[PDB]
Structure formats: structure tokens, C-alpha cells
Design an enzyme around this catalytic site. Structure first.
Site, PDB file in Angstrom:
ATOM      1  N   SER A  43     -23.862  43.797  20.546  1.00 29.66           N
ATOM      2  CA  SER A  43     -24.915  44.810  20.654  1.00 29.66           C
ATOM      3  C   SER A  43     -26.294  44.189  20.634  1.00 29.66           C
ATOM      4  CB  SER A  43     -24.790  45.762  19.490  1.00 29.66           C
ATOM      5  OG  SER A  43     -24.982  45.083  18.235  1.00 29.66           O
ATOM      6  N   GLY A  70     -20.112  45.898  19.521  1.00 30.18           N
ATOM      7  CA  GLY A  70     -18.885  45.781  18.760  1.00 30.18           C
ATOM      8  C   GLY A  70     -18.029  44.543  19.039  1.00 30.18           C
ATOM      9  N   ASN A 100     -19.841  40.372  14.253  1.00 28.87           N
ATOM     10  CA  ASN A 100     -18.825  41.438  14.162  1.00 28.87           C
ATOM     11  C   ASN A 100     -17.430  40.965  13.796  1.00 28.87           C
ATOM     12  OD1 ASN A 100     -20.762  43.370  14.965  1.00 28.87           O
ATOM     13  ND2 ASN A 100     -20.303  43.080  17.165  1.00 28.87           N
ATOM     14  N   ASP A 188     -31.517  49.581  10.932  1.00 27.41           N
ATOM     15  CA  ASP A 188     -30.300  49.807  10.186  1.00 27.41           C
ATOM     16  C   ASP A 188     -29.800  48.514   9.501  1.00 27.41           C
ATOM     17  OD1 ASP A 188     -29.390  48.328  12.308  1.00 27.41           O
ATOM     18  OD2 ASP A 188     -27.725  49.648  12.848  1.00 27.41           O
ATOM     19  N   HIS A 191     -29.195  45.940  13.721  1.00 26.29           N
ATOM     20  CA  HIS A 191     -29.824  45.950  15.043  1.00 26.29           C
ATOM     21  C   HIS A 191     -31.300  45.678  14.871  1.00 26.29           C
ATOM     22  CE1 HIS A 191     -26.218  48.401  15.764  1.00 26.29           C
ATOM     23  NE2 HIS A 191     -26.348  48.072  17.040  1.00 26.29           N
TER      24      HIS A 191
END
Ligand SMILES: *[P@](C)(=O)O[C@@H](C)C(C)(C)C
Length: 212
Positions: A43, A70, A100, A188, A191
Site C-alpha cells: 500500500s 496488503g 505486512n 493511521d 500509511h
């Protein structure tokens, strides 16, 4: 085997086939275009394209962005082996993936990154490879920060004597003195905001200019 380096697609457990749709689009992109630079990863790579920074810094370089939200290392590896490196001859491939890889040790994640570099060295031997370090994450100190740091150390050691593989730490210092990451840099704590992408992309664009 190292699950991080065993190529596999993302199994569709939801039903809308989005992952395969993205892969197929990228395959079509490679079939149709002649990029000088190919960006691939998760991402963090994908959303770099959604920023206005992409059109100002990277578009001029003749670049394709194959980021998929992801993705872990083994997913990127599968995609590179299954069509996304076909019909092209890029000067540089940029890799950014590993954050991830939940459930994989830092050593395994490193093995997945090294597998990606090796595959690129085989399929696109003329291309230089740039690997971005995994960024810190989480608002406060946590195991994933240590994990990603350890991956960066190990990857950097692996790439140092590889004279057309380039490790780049694009982290300008997101983790502050009090041990926190500001939501102004990562909305968040994972990101990057537009503000977060600024120093990261600037660092990358600089390196790309030197190599190119
Ligand atoms: P990027 C770090 O791949 O973001 C991931 C974790 C999703 C939120 C699942 C797209």
C-alpha cells in the site's frame, strides 16, 4: 521453506477478485508500455501513485506503479514471476514490501526481500534494484518497530556488497524523541499522509536521479 520466499498469490476469500484484477492490469501495463522504472510493493508504494507527488516527481521518469495494498514479500515475488516483468526492459526496479509479513520472523522477511532482488536480477539483469527500508509504525514503541528495524539491518547487510542493488532508508525520523509517531506524518500510524510522503519521495527521487 521460508513462507516469505515461496511465491504465492493472494487467495480470494471475499469474492470480488480485486487482487487478480490489479495483477492483470499491471500485466497489461507491462505488455503495452516501455517503462524505465517499475515500482512494486505494498500500500506504501500504491498510494504514492495517488498523491500529486507522483505526477511531479516520478511520471517524468517513465514509471509504472504496481503497488497492491496488503501484499507481503511472497505475493510480490509471485507477481514478478507471473507476468509483471514481461515485455519490458526497465533501467531500475524499486521494491518496497515486508511491513505486512505478519507471522514471519525478521530473518524470513529478509529472505523474501533477497528472493525478490534475485528474481529481478534473473529476469531483468540490466536493471539496478532499489530496496526501500521498512518504515516504523504504531503510535508508540512496539514489536513491529523492532522487527522492521531488524529487517532493515539484515537487508542492508545483504545488499551492501551487491553493486547494482541499492538499500535506501527513506525514514527522515518519523519516530520522535518521546517515542511517538505523529498522525500528521502517518494518519493511521502506518500509511503516509501527503506530508509524510514528502521527505520519503524526495529521498527516493534523488537516488533515482543519480542512478538514472
Ligand atoms: P499497506 C502497509 O500494504 O496497507 C495494508 C496493511 C492494507 C491496509 C491492508 C492495505
Amino acid at each position: 521453506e521460508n513462507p516469505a520466499s515461496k511465491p504465492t498469490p493472494v487467495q480470494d476469500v471475499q469474492g470480488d477478485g480485486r487482487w487478480m484484477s490489479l495483477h492483470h492490469r499491471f500485466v497489461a501495463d507491462s505488455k503495452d508500455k516501455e517503462p524505465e522504472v517499475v515500482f512494486i510493493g505494498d500500500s506504501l508504494v500504491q498510494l504514492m501513485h495517488q498523491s500529486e507527488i507522483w505526477r511531479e516527481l516520478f511520471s517524468p521518469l517513465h514509471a509504472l506503479n504496481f503497488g497492491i495494498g496488503g501484499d507481503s514479500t511472497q505475493h510480490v515475488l509471485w507477481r514478478l514471476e507471473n507476468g509483471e516483468l514481461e515485455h519490458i526492459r526497465p533501467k531500475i526496479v524499486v521494491v518496497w514490501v515486508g511491513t505486512n509479513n505478519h507471522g514471519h520472523t525478521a530473518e524470513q522477511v529478509t529472505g523474501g526481500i533477497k528472493a525478490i532482488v534475485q528474481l529481478v536480477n534473473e529476469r531483468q539483469p540490466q536493471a539496478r534494484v532499489v530496496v526501500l527500508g521498512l518504515l516504523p509504525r504504531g503510535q508508540h514503541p512496539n514489536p513491529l518497530r523492532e522487527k522492521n528495524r531488524r529487517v532493515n539491518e539484515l537487508v542492508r547487510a545483504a545488499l551492501a556488497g551487491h553493486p547494482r542493488a541499492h538499500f535506501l532508508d527513506a525514514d527522515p525520523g518519523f519516530v520522535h524523541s518521546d517515542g511517538t509517531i505523529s498522525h500528521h506524518d502517518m494518519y493511521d500510524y502506518l500509511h503516509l499522509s501527503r506530508l509524510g510522503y514528502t521527505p520519503v519521495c524526495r529521498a527516493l527521487h534523488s537516488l533515482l536521479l543519480r542512478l538514472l
